[PDB]
């Protein structure tokens, strides 16, 4: 109750994140672009960089 900080309700969320052998799944807001083969490219795929 608000009658109680010490004994008052606090919401908790734990977000836990996975890097399995699978393709990635839960993705950021970033924008994709063209696949420039046979040149020295800096790259991100899916955070793998």
């Amino acid at each position: 109750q608000p009658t109680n900080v010490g004994y008052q309700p606090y919401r908790v969320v734990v977000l836990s994140f996975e890097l399995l052998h699978a393709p990635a799944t839960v993705c950021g807001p970033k924008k994709s672009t063209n696949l420039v083969k046979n040149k020295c490219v800096n790259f991100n795929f899916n955070g793998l960089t």
Partner: peptide, 24 residues
């Protein structure tokens, strides 16, 4: 009713193209 299993029951542990390799 019984047998020797022989070399059976393996399964892919992960989705990686490792190739031409002995890997533990």
């Amino acid at each position: 009713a019984y047998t020797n299993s022989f070399t059976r029951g393996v399964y892919y542990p992960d989705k990686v193209f490792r190739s031409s390799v002995l890997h533990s």
